[PDB]
Amino acid sequence: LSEQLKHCNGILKELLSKKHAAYAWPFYKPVDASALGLHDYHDIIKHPMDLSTVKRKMENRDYRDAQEFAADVRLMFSNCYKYNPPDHDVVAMARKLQDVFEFRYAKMPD
Numbered sequence: 808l809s810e811q812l813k814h815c816n817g818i819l820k821e822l823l824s825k826k827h828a829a830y831a832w833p834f835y836k837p838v839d840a841s842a843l844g845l846h847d848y849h850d851i852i853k854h855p856m857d858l859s860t861v862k863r864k865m866e867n868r869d870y871r872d873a874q875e876f877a878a879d880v881r882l883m884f885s886n887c888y889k890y891n892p893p894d895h896d897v898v899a900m901a902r903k904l905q906d907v908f909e910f911r912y913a914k915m916p917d
């Protein structure tokens with residue numbers, strides 16, 4: 808891990824931590840469209856993403872740089888904003904978790 812990717816790994820640890828679990832847990836595993844009845848989910852969302860996938864990629868040392876890590880995390884959030892109306896509970900949860908991500912990601916030394 809580069810120093811930037813070590814920083815990203817620490818961010819991932821925080822996003823997965825009990826501190827944020829009350830709004831992070833819908834992002835812990837891939838959206839299960841069949842169980843939830845999200846009929847059009849895989850038509851609307853071309854590239855699903857979630858924290859278990861980010862965690863797998865980081866653990867396997869698959870990210871080439873910090874930008875690749877950030878793109879996945881933002882893809883996860885953007886999918887949630889794209890699929891859901893603005894007043895849905897899960898959009899508010901996404902925003903609270905993204906507050907954590909964007910602030911800590913911005914503090915990455917460069």
Ligand SMILES: CCOC(=O)Nc1cc(-c2ccc(C)c(NS(C)(=O)=O)c2)nn2c(C)nnc12
Pocket residue numbers: 832833834835836837838839840843845886887890891897
């Ligand atoms: C028409 C109503 O729209 C929605 O219900 N939307 C969304 C719902 C949930 C969601 C809820 C409850 C549970 C138990 C789960 N679990 S999981 C990760 O296995 O699928 C997920 N996540 N979500 C994400 C991300 N993005 N959108 C949604």
